[PDB]
Structures are given as C-alpha cells and as structure tokens.
Amino acid sequence: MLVLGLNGNFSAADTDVVPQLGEVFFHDSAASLIRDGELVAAVEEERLNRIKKTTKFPLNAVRECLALAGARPEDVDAVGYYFPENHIDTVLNHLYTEYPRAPLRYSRELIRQRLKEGLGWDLPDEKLVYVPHHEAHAYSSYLHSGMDSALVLVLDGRGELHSGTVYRAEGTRLEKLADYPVPKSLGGLYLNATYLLGYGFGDEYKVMGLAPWGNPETYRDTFAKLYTLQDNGEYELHGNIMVPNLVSPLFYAEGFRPRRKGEPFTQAHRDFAAALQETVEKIVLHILEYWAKTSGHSRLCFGGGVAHNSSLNGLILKSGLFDEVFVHPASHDAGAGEGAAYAAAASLGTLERPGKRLLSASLGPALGGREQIRARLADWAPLIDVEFPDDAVETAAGLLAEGQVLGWAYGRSEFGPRALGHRSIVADARPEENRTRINAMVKKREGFRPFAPVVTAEAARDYFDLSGADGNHEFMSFVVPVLPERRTELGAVTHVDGTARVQVVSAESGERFHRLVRRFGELTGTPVLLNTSFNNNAEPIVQSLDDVVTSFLTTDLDVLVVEDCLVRGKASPDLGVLVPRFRPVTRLVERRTAGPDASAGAKTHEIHLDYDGGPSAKVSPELYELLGAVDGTTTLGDLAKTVGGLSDALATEVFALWEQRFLTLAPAGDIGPL
Amino acid sequence: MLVLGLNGNFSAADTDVVPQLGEVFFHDSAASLIRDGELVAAVEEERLNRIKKTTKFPLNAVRECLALAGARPEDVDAVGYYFPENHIDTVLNHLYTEYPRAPLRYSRELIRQRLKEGLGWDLPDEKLVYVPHHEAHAYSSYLHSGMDSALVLVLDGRGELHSGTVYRAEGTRLEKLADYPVPKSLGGLYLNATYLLGYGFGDEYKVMGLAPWGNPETYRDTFAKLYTLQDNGEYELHGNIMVPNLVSPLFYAEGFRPRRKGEPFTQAHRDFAAALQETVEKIVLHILEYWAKTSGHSRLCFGGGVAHNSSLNGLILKSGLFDEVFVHPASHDAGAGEGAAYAAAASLGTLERPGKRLLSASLGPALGGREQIRARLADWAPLIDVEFPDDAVETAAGLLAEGQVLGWAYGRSEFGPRALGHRSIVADARPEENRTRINAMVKKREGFRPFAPVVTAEAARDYFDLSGADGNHEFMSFVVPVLPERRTELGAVTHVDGTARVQVVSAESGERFHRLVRRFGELTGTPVLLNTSFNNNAEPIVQSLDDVVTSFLTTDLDVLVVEDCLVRGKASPDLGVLVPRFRPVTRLVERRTAGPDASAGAKTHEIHLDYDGGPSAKVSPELYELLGAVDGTTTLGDLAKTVGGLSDALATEVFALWEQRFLTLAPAGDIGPL
Ligand SMILES: [Cl-]
Ligand SMILES: [Fe+3]
Ligand SMILES: [Fe+3]
C-alpha cells in the first residue's frame, strides 16, 4: 500500500489557474507519501518553488516524494485530495464566473493533467479519492500520536462545511462528536484581527509573538462584544454587515486605527494582540473543558491550523483537562494533505497506521551524497572557503560557545513550519544580545519577536516547567514557562513573559542535533541553544544545498555547517561567476505613466514576482538591460559586458535583488539528482 | 441656498485610494448642484474622466456644476455625501487594513483634500453633511415626481444597513415604513446571476435585454430554491457558505456551465436570463402588492439601482397596484448623490423642493457657444467636412428618411444612463435590419441587443400601450407593449416579446428633439425614431464636442448633426494632425516574462488603462517607441517622424488604439471655456 496525499490549488509553475489567484485559495500546497501506514516522505511545495505558503500545484513535491520512496508514479495505489470534490469544484466554478476567459477545468481534470504533463503519470479515476477536510486533519493528528484512543479536536480556517470538528478516535476509527459552522472560525477571527496590525495572511504567528508584550485588560471588554461563550461547549461570534472582517468595524468605532507598514508597534498594538490571543484561548479552553468531561477522554490530539498557536497549546497543557496532548509538526493544510492519504487508504481497503508516535519531522529531500556535496561546494569556490573538520559537531559546538551564529543544514528538511535541527540557524541561548542582533541583523525582523530554544531531553526539566499533561515537545508545539531561576541564564530564548516555545531534542528524535546541544552544554554548562528557522525574510525554509549557500551568503551568518563541511564567505566574493536565472514568476517591466500636461511620463524599470502578494523592486536602466539578456547559461560577469562590465555598483544592485530572491543566482550547473 | 450633492469614492485622476481599488467600491461617482430647491446641474464623473461607472472622486463634475451655476466653490452653502460617515469610513478602514502602506485618510479628510487641491476650496467641517443612503435615493426619486404624497420604494445593491427601504412621502417629509436587510439585495442577486453569463459589474442591463429571448420555465424551479416569498411582504434569499455568490453553487450542481468570453449565448443562457428576470419581478411585485394595500397609497415613486430594470417597471405599471408611477432618470447612486444635497438642505435649516415634475435629464455641461463650436470644428478640418444648413432639424429628418444613421449632439448632456436627444444616435425605427446594422457596425456590440424608440407625445398612444397606471415616459423608465397592429411597422424597436422601452418626447421635455421626431413623421407617416446612446463599446456617453467628433470618426455613422452643423468624415482623414495625449490612467509597458531554461522570456509591448477592469492591448515595437515620446503637444505626424514617418500600417495601428480610447487623440489646443 503506497498512497499519495495532496493539498493545494492546481496552478502551474509560471501561471495561476486564474490571473493573480488569491493567496488564500487552497494554500500551503504539499505532497505526502505513506507506505504500509508509515509516513515515508513529505514536503511542502513552498520549499521547492520558494514561494511561502504557495497555492501552486505541488508537482515538485510529488516528484521529490516518489524519489525518496524509490517509487515510480505507477507504484502509487491511491491519491487522496484534502477536500470534497463538490466543494473545490464549486470554488473553481466561482473563480471561473469572475474570469470568463478561463477554461472550465475542474479539479479532477486539473489533478490528472498536472500528474500526466508533469510526471508522465496517467492517474486512473478510480484511484483518486476526495476526502472531508477535517477528517484528513484528524487522521494526520491522531494516527501519528502513538495513542490507541483519544479526543481529537480540529480547528482551522475552514473545511467544506465547518470551522471546527470534534472526534472520538479508537483504534483506526474516527467517530464525529460535534462541529462548529464556518462563520465561527477561530482561524478567521485571528486572521481578521491580524490585519489590524499591518500584517497579512500567514503572519498570525507573529501576532502570537507580540501578544506577551501587551496587557489583555485594555481591549478585553471590546473583544467580549465579538463573542459569547454558551452552555455545553458552545460559543458564538458576532458578525456585522459592514465589511468582511469581524474585528475592524468595532475597533474602528472605538478609535483603534490599523498599524501601517514601517510604523512601530505601540503599546496599544501590543495590548490588542494580547487581548486577541486571550480571546482565542478562552474559546478553545471552553470547547475543550466541555468535550473533555463529556467524551470522557484523558488524551487529546489537536490539529488544524489553529493548533500552530503554541501559546494556546501551552495553556491546554497547563489546564489539567488532559493527561496527554499530541500535536503534529504540520497541523495546517499540509497535514490535511497527509491525512487525505490515510483516508484514501481507508476507503479502498484496510487502514494501516504508524506503529509509533512521530518524533522527527525530517521528511523532505536531503542535500545530497558526500561526493556531490563536495563537488557542488567547489562550484561555489569563488564565493566561499570550505574546511572539512574531523568532527564537525565538536567544532560547531566550540564555535557556538565562542559566540558564532551558525547555519546548520543536515539531511532531510523539516515538514511543517518549525526548524528542528535540519535547516536551522543556531546560536548561544544565554546572551540577551543574541536576540537583539539575530532579529535585527540576521533574520531582519521585528525586535519584539521571540526566539525558541532547543534543549536535550536529559536536561529539559532543569530549565523548563513541563508539568501538567505530557505534551510532545519534539516539534516546538508547546509554549512552557522557563523556570524562574534559569530566566537570567537563558537571556536570548526567554520571552518577555518568562516562557519559551521549547524543542526537546533526544537521541531518538534528532541524534546529531542532540549531540550538538549536549556537547555545547558540556563546554559551557548550558545544554540549550537558540534555534530559529534557516531562511531570510524573503524565503521559506531553505531546501537544497544551493538554497543553503545562497541564504548563508545573503544573511549575516558567521559560519555554515552543512553535512560536516565548514563554510565561510570569502573576503571578496566574485559575484561575476554566478549564472542568473529567472524564476518561473520573475518579470521585468519598463513602464511609463501619464506625465505633466498629459505627456508620457519618465521611464521606470522594475523586477517583480508574478503572484498575488509578490514583491517588486525598482532597477536601474543598466540592470534592466543586463537582466533582459539572461539566458540561463551565461554568467553574470559575461552578461554585464553588454552594459560595459560588472561595475561594483551593478554587483551591489544585483546582490540586493538576490537577497530578495527576485531571481536565482548560483554557479553554472547543479548538484544533480540526489 | 446652494447645495452640492456628492457620491463616489475618493481616488485622484491617476491613482486609486488603494491600488486597483475594486470597481464596486462606491461607483458611478457624480456631482449635483441644487439651488433654492431646483436641480440646476448634474453630471456623472464617467462623462469627464471617460471611465464607465467610475469610482473616482467627482472633482471634474463638481467643477462643471459650479460653472453651470455661475458659482465659486465658496458660494456653496452645504455639501451632502450619499452615505453616513461611520459607514464609508469603516469601509475605507477595511481597505486600509488590506493595504498597510496606505495612509489613514478617512472620508471627511479626503473630501476636503480633493476640494482644496482641486478647486482651492477650503470646506468648513460644519458644511459637510452625511446622509443615510436610502434616504438620499428617496428624496431624489420623490422630490422630482411632482406628487404631493407617495409610497416611495428604494431597492439597490445596498446602503449602509439595508438593500431595500419603504417610505411614505408627504410634502417634504419622509417617513420610513419598512426595510429589507443587505443579504436580501436584489441588486446583489441580479449581479451574482449576471456573472454566470460571462458578464460582469454594470452588465445587468444587457442581461435584461437578453431575457425576452428566453423561456423562463426551464430554470423557474431552480431559482425557486433560492428565494421564498413570505407573509406581510417579506421574502428570503437562501444563501450558502460555499462562495460569495448566491446563484453559482446551485446552478453548478445542476450542470449549468458559465458562459466564456466570445462564446455565443446558448438557449440555456437565454432561458437563464429569463428565469432570473422573472424572479426579481416576482419578488418586487410581491413587496409592492403588500405595501400598496397596507399603505393604501395610489402613487408610487420607485428608486435605487434596481429601478433601472425597465422590464420590471413596465410590469409595475401594468399591475394596477397604482394610479401613478414616477422613476428618476438617474435612479442609481448618481441620483443618491443628488438626493444627498436635499437631505443636507433639510439638515441645515430648511428644505426647498422642485416646483414641477422633472421632464428633462439635460443637466450636464453643454457643447459650447456656436462660435467656439465652429472654431473648434475648423481645428478638425483635416479629418471632417462641415455644412451649415438653414434648418439642421429639417435636413436631419430627411437624411433619416433616406435611411442614414445619425449622430445627434445638442446642448447639455443627459444625467443618467439613457440618451434622450442630447447625446444620441438616431435612425429610422421601421426596418428590422437596422438592429443588426447598428449593433454590428456602429455600437459594435451583441446582436440580440434591442433598440429603443422615441415617439412624440401626440402619436404615443397610436403606437404604444401606455394603459395601466400613468407612468412618466420622458426618461425611458418603462418597457411597454407595442400595439400588435404596429409591431411590423416598428421593426427596429420592437423586442421579440412585442415590447419597447419607449421615450415619449414632448415640446416640454425636449423641444428640438420633439420637432425632429415630428418632422420625420410628417415625412414618412411614422413619427417614431430609433434612439440609442452616443458612445462606442469602449466609452460612456460622449460629453464634449471633441468626444462627439472622436466617437463619430471612430464609428461607422453616416452623418453627425452637432449644434446645427452637419459633419462627415473626409474621404482620407489626416490622422497626422492629431495631438496624442496620455489619459491619467494610460500606462505604456515593455514586459519580459520567464522563458524556457530559466531565461528571460518573451518581450511584449503593451498599452493599458490602470484601473480595475481596464482594457489592455499589445502594440508594435515601433508604436511603443513613438508613444514613449508623447509630450502632449507634438502632433502624431511629427512624433512619427522619429520612427520613419506615419505609415499606413502605423496610422491603422494608432486608429485601432484610438477606437479603444487608450489615449486622447484630438487637434492642438481645445474648445476653451464653454
Ligand atoms: Cl420616521
Ligand atoms: Fe485546514
Ligand atoms: Fe444605491
């Protein structure tokens, strides 16, 4: 039994199903592969097409999953899709009424066209299974829990008919207990409020990071007008007929004005975030207080996008409502994609399930063999210096103890949003200053943002308060208190409220990363590291070796440790040897608007990424001419001849566009098949 | 007592308040000026920025109205805006949460900014009055009816809180009897349905033109699942949680497939339009039978945008529920803007009302003095020949009896969507072939589109069944049956169901246009003329003399009659003397997309209009280079020298862009102040 799980929309690499298809239409595209009930490969398409939370069809993810399994497309017994057929087709039909030039291609045709054109795979209709969305979420969360019975809660933005569902789980059978309609969505509520802070889709976790800086008292009674807790685990959200946002009208009427980009986060912004987070905590704990005592289950599995609210999870852990809580590293729609495979298996035969709790999210493609990685790093020689230490982990722990900030790239990439020791940036967790600088200089993000620690399993309870239920901490699912007598010691990773979104690494969850953290603790007395995701502000978590080196070279990291190679940037790196490549969404434009006296205005030149929400940047006339000559094979230095040579100014302009990922800059060639 | 009425959004000429601001956010911008209770000027902003149903701030319209009244901005005593302040500001606030770069300027500050920058007018806060939306509609519909009291029904897309409102009007007092909530919008229902026909916003009236070709029976039972008629003049529309369209999910589930662009209208599409029209009719006649009997009133004023459903209006007239019915020529939001002026007058002190029933919509700017028209037409000499007959009307009637299609342009432009003798295209109403003739080769639009007759007051009852109530027919508000013994005689203007959207012209409503239709009747025995709006497929109704000449020269009209001048196109018109000017929304673009093997891909040159739903066209590299040098003063011929001269190929390419109005093409200078 080999089964493919699919989620996302159906757009090709270079176009979308309709022009500028909204980023909210079936996002976080991913593919997962289960064999004999075990999750053998999973990767989000964003990692391969480099568009965060992408809606595009996860063609590359399917290809990578098959390769990791050693399978051909014909080996796949079934394909599950994470929504019912009528729902996804009704939404496509809606988009087609708005875009009368678009061909009437519904999901079955589009899935089969993509697999046929993209993989040479003729999928039989009888192998395609559409699955209720919250059923897919629940299967994913519960089957990886290691529990043989549980309460399973799913809360997300929405399924086909519900924003929340409660299941009883026993053996491999799911039995629905309750649901909550779409307009009560806590995902929708959190996103509605997120837009008031100058943030958008996908930024909710940043708002969660802001909330502990605020006092929930300021806006508590305002948010209380937007919901009512009702008897027997019910609740209500109070909508409005003014605009499609539950939150902005009332807060506008009370004088709250939405933050603008580039403005600071005031105390009122912080308090708003705090009152929002408390609101969702109050609702979910109300749901669970009721269903704990009603269903009688002492164990909980929590999935759906809302289960990525780690503060909420930490409160559930401390609530005492349950003895055990489990959360999957991919509780958003990539996990529903995985759950759709289990559901598809269930509908065609018997359901085979994992035999153990999931401990590792290291499930994507790896970086390559020993030899192909060494050969590819040689291709980067004009930009990097490379050492091959006898014991890279020993050396990396020493560098960390010396205050270096490291890129850390090993093996198979993490499924789900958290970096966990395979595509990480790590630093000493003790100095508070590391938080200040890694926010400001390395990740280039807001100073309020917290940093998550990783700790060895053996030392975890010396630093963090894990009391209450037994939660799984392999995937940073839970915020927990830092023990008070350790808060000064852990300056970089203790949040303003004394908590931390902890990763507890063990020899079984992540042997190499555990050894790193253990050795560091032996050197310093503190077996704790800061662990943030390996990506700059313009990209998802890095995937390939070229991704890793590119990111190292365009962030202000000290050293890169990749598959036991020690990489440093050269004193003067020769950008001219890099070959520019368009991304499938890269566009160049020369534009004139109207000018004075109805003249044609002055020319300007821009590069942009053609997808909804894509960035854009002004370019000089010389860079515009240089980039128009890009062929995929010629180096940047040879290209720059035609505009009179790669001046330092052109190299600097190119470097800034590289940092923002408007195009691919890498040595000639590639690493080859893995 | 001089009062300015305002409706629309707040965007400048060349940008929108938020980028690509949806065409549905406060559309049909307009300005109205009342003085001592009389409407002295009104024009829609679309006529001036040449963007159909524009949302942009009606700055030009305000300027034109002030000039028509001989007023300084400072002479205005009060300004009324057609929505309450909290509602429009809440919608702007919602736009601003979606665009965190947009500065937080709300409606009061934007109104003052546009008037200060645009007119030097410093508007005191005390002079700006915001109005309930359906109240503005109701004042405008009722106060121009000539009635002493009436039942007033308003049905539109939505106001701040309702989609329908019912008033009793007496003297100048409005008393609210009932309302219907936003989700019951019949404007909303009609537009949702319209999308299924490959049409969009603003195309509803085309769907109404299609409905008689269809049989309402085939989808009657399907539409019946979407609404329920209830006691006490109540009804319900049955929504869905699938997509924001009432209509598409159910019709998709029954195998209805939305029409694609360029596809013919099938019999299914025709029957769909027929069942949709029957539905809104059934609901509104159900509202009206309950409120005619409950209120006991024999007079009805019907307003809001749904009151432009001419077929519905004819059915109301024939229902016997009322003795009198009045419909305003601008019952859409431009009329709400007018009605906001009256409400502002009632707020600040005392309200004065018009002395008589409105007979003429001729309220916009005029074409100019006879001396400046002659002078400006001489500027067009390299493209046209002009005659100055002794009696243009006499000549025009003969030319029409000879079978020519005329442009007819006189005096002040029509307020509201119907042409009525001031910006019209007129032809013989007798020949059936004139429909396909003027659709295909003049309006360049669909063939099913019926044409409307204008008839003298004296002959009206010889041709049209005006029985039932006494309706006002000066504005083409009602569809009425053509008498069966006249249907063959009126071949061009009788729909497939024997009906016609008639204009009855009188010496009182439009003297010149009356004399024209009378004379043609003396010459032919048929005092009826086909009357369609003076615009091609790419523009609103033409406004200025330059608009009139441009439209005549870019359509296939035989002759243009404009202010007693007879205009024909020269055998070989010299396009080279035309000065090209960018419109404020004109953008000229060279584009490179992504290519195979990650190269810089296809190079294209395009012109487009930068507003939501704006057209675009590919251009040749040569025209791209020529249009880039447009300075607003150099002629097309002189600009063409820089690329080798105005060749026939280039002149043809430019002409096709001119026809689509991508840029302004006109002789040097302008007509000057009117
Ligand atoms: Cl009242
Ligand atoms: Fe979900
Ligand atoms: Fe309205």
The two structure tokens encoding residue A516: 């790193």
Q: How far apart are CA B598 and CA B601, in angstroms?
A: 8
Nearest to B258 among A89, A96, A252 (CB): A96
Chain B residues inside the 8 Å CB shell of A49: none
Using DSSP's 3-state secondary structure scheme, residue B526 falls into: coil
Structure tokens given for A173: 């059978």
Q: Calculate ∠ Cα A541-A544-A550, nearest 5°.
A: 75
Distance CA B674, CA B299 (A): 41
Token readout for B71 is 């007023």
Is A90–B243 a contact, with Cβ atoms under 8 angstroms apart?
A: yes
Q: Could you give the CA distance from residue A215 to residue A213 in angstroms, rounded to a whole number?
A: 7
Q: Which of B589, B592, B630 to mutate to test the interface with A (most CBs of A within 10 A)?
A: B592
Q: How many residues does chain A have?
A: 674
Residue of A93, A194, A248, A631 for testing the chain B interface, max B β-carbons within 10 Å: A93
Ligand nearest to the CA of B175: 1
CB contact (8 A) between residue B581 and residue A593 = no
Radius of gyration of chain A (CA): 25
Q: Of chain A residues 336-395, which have a CB less than 8 A from chain B? A: none
A657 touches chain B (CB under 8 A): no
* Tokens coding B551: 């439209």
SS3 assignment, position B519: helix
- Whether A600 and B584 lie within 8 Å, measured CB to CB: no
Dist CA B570 CA B552 (whole Å):
12
Q: Among all ligands shown, which has an atom nearest to the Cα of A162?
A: 2
Q: Does A600 contact B630 at a Cβ distance shorter than 8 Å?
A: yes
Angle between helices A59-69 and A107-119 (to 10 degrees): 60
Mode of pairing for the β-strands spanning B2-7 and B30-35:
antiparallel
For residues B105 and B124, the answer to whether their CB atoms sit within 8 Å is no
Q: What's the alpha-carbon Rg for chain B, to the nearest Å?
A: 25
Q: Which residues of B touch A250 (CB under 8 A)?
A: none
What does residue B564 show for φ and ψ, rounded to 5 degrees? 70, 5
Residue B65: name the closest of B36, B38, B34, B37 by CA.
B34
Cross-chain residue pair A104–B586, CB shorter than 8 Å: no
| CA–CA dist B556, A311 (Å, integer) | 70
- Please provide the size of chain B in residues: 674
Q: Helix, strand or coil for residue B224?
A: helix
Please identify which residue in the block is written with the tokens 């986060």. Answer: A265
CA torsion, ordered A136, A137, A140, A141, to nearest 10 deg: -150
Q: Which residues have CB under 8 Å from B629's CB, separation 6+?
A: A600, B639, B642
Q: CB–CB of A243/B90 below 8 Å?
A: yes
Q: Which residues of A561-589 are buried (b: 16+ CB within 10 A; e: fewer)?
A: bbbbbbbebeeebebbbbbbbbbbbbbbb
B82 CA → ligand 1 middle, Å:
18
Q: Where is B227: in which H helix or E strand?
A: strand B227-230
Q: Give the B window 8-27 contacts with A, CB below 8 Å.
A: 14
| Separation between Cα atoms, residue A636 and residue A656, nearest integer Å | 14
Chain B hits for A200, CB-CB cut-off 8 Å, are 98, 100
> Given B96, B593, B598, which is nearest A258 (Cβ)?
B96
Quote the CA–CA distance of B152 and B142 in Å, as a whole number.
7
B contact test, residue of A87, A97, A634 with most B CBs within 10 A:
A97
Distance from CA of A228 to the nearest CA of B (A): 22
Contact between A582 and B600 using a beta-carbon 8 Å cutoff: yes
Q: Helices marked H in B161-263 — which ranges?
A: 186-195, 204-210, 217-223, 248-253
Closest among B157, B232, B223 to B193, alpha carbons compared: B223
Closest CA to A132 of A355, A304, A2, A353: A304
> What is the DSSP-derived secondary structure letter of residue B260?
P
CA distances from A552 to A382, A592, B155 (A): 15, 37, 61
Taking CB atoms and an 8 Å cutoff, what residues of chain A touch B630?
599-600
Angstrom distances, CA of residue B526 to CA of A7, B429, B462: 67, 8, 10
Q: How far is A252 from chain B (nearest CA, A)?
A: 7
| B186 exposure class (CB count in 10 Å sphere: 0-12, 13-18, 19+) | buried
E-assigned strands of A463-615? 470-471, 479-481, 499-501, 503-505, 528-533, 559-562, 565-569, 578-582, 586-592, 604-609
Å between B404 CA and nearest CA of chain A: 36
Element (H, E) at A637: helix A636-641
> What is the crossing angle of helices B333-347 and B133-143, to 10°?
90
Q: Tokens for B90, please give them.
A: 């809440």
Residues 555-594 of B with CB under 8 A from A: 581-594
Give how far Cα A341 sits from Cα of A6, A132, A352, B46, Å: 8, 12, 11, 54
Question: Could you tell me if B565 and A577 are in contact, meaning their C-beta atoms sit under 8 angstroms apart?
Answer: no
- Kindly give the pairing relationship between strand B423-428 and strand A470-471: unpaired
| SS3 assignment for B560-610 | EEECCEEEEECCCCCHHHCEEEECCCEEEEEEEEECHHHCEEEEEEEEEEC
Place of tokens 């042409």: B419
B266 touches chain A (CB under 8 A): no
**From start to end of B410-527, where are the E strands?**
423-428, 453-456, 470-471, 479-481, 499-501, 503-505
**Residue A387 to chain B, least CA–CA distance (Å):** 32
- B132: closest CA of chain A, how far (Å): 14
**Nearest-CA distance B608 → chain A (Å):** 10
Distance CA B46, CA B543 (A): 9
Of A244, A245, A591, the CB nearest to B587: A591
The Cα B227–Cα B244 span in angstroms is: 16
Q: Which residue shows structure tokens 């007033």?
A: B152
Cα(B470)–Cα(B474) distance, rounded to whole angstroms?
A: 12
- Per the CB < 8 Å rule, is B261 touching A100? yes
CA distance linking residue A598 with residue A516, whole number of Å: 66
Q: How far is CA B403 from the centre of its chain?
A: 28
- Which residues in chain A are contacts of B94 at CB distance < 8 A? 242-245, 248-249
Q: How far is CA B110 from the centre of its chain?
A: 25
**Is B204 assigned to a binding site?**
yes
Residue of A nearest to B588 (CA): A592
In chain A, residues with a C-beta closer than 8 Å to the C-beta of B87 are 242
Structure tokens at B603: 């190079």
- With tokens 């083409």, the residue in question is B476
Q: Distance (Å, rounded) from C-alpha A614 to C-alpha A22?
A: 11
Decide if A619 contacts A607 (C-beta within 8 A): yes
Dist. CA A420–CA A394, nearest whole Å: 19
Dist. CA B167 → ligand 1 center (Å): 8
> Do A597 and B96 make contact, defined as CB atoms within 8 angstroms?
no
Burial class (CB in 10 A: 0-12, 13-18, 19+), B159: buried
Q: What are phi and psi of B142, to 5 degrees?
A: -80, -45
Nearest to A51 by CA among A34, A27, A79, A82: A27
Coil, strand or helix at A549: helix
In angstroms, the Cα distances linking A387 to A402, A570, B131, B276 are 18, 12, 74, 74
CATH number at A149-334: 3.30.420.40
Nearest-neighbour CA in chain B from A2: distance (Å): 32
Angle at B63 between CA B59 and CA B69, to 5 degrees: 145
For A571, which DSSP code?
S
Residue numbers of B between 140 and 179 with CB closer than 8 Å to A: 160-161
Nearest by Cα to B109 from B133, B132, B81, B137: B81
> Does A410 touch chain B if contact means CB atoms closer than 8 Å?
no
Structural tokens at position A529: 């590291």
The answer to whether the beta carbons of residues A364 and A548 sit under 8 Å apart is: no
Q: Is A204 annotated as a binding residue?
A: yes
Q: Which of B83, B88, B89, B93 to mutate to test the interface with A (most CBs of A within 10 A)?
A: B93
Amino acid at A368: G
Closest-CA residue of A relative to B86 is A253
DSSP track, A390-438: S-HHHHHHHHHHTT--EEEE-SSPBSSS---SSEEEEEESS-HHHHHHI
Centre of ligand 1 from the C-alpha of residue B180, in Å: 16
Q: DSSP assignment, residue A351?
A: P
- Within 10 A of B533 (CB to CB), how many other CB atoms are there? 17
Q: How was this structure determined?
A: X-ray
Indicate yes or no: CB of A632 within 8 angstroms of CB of B258. Answer: no
Q: Cβ of B250 under 8 Å from any chain A Cβ?
A: no
Measured between its terminal Cα atoms, the distance across chain A in Å is 25
Give me B152's structure tokens: 């007033």
- Inter-chain CB proximity B260 and A595 less than 8 Å: no
- SS3 track for A156-219: CCCCCCEEEEEEEEECCEEEEEEEEEHHHCHHHHHHHHHHHHCCCCCCHHHHHHHHHHCCCHHH
Find all residues with CB under 8 Å of A512, minimum gap 6, and list them.
A393, A410, A411, A421
- Whole-number Cα distances in Å, B256 to A444, B189, B322: 51, 17, 38
DSSP A439: I
CB contact (8 A) between residue B600 and residue A629:
yes
CATH number at A364-569: 3.90.870.20
Closest C-alpha among A333, A287, A304 to residue A83: A333
The helix, strand and coil proportions of chain B, stated in percent and rounded to the nearest 5, come to: 35, 20, 40
Q: How far apart are CA A583 and CA B126, in angstroms?
A: 56
* Side-by-side strand order, sheet with B324-326: B173-181, B162-170, B149-155, B299-303, B324-326, B470-471
CA angle centred on A55, ends A108 and B601, rounded to 5°: 100
Question: Tokens for B644?
Answer: 């080798």
Distance B161 CA to ligand 3 centre (A): 11
> Which residues in chain A (186-225) have CB-CB distances under 8 A to chain B?
195-196, 198-200
Let me know: does A53 contact A46? Beta carbons within 8 Å: yes
B352 alpha carbon – ligand 1 mean position (Å): 19
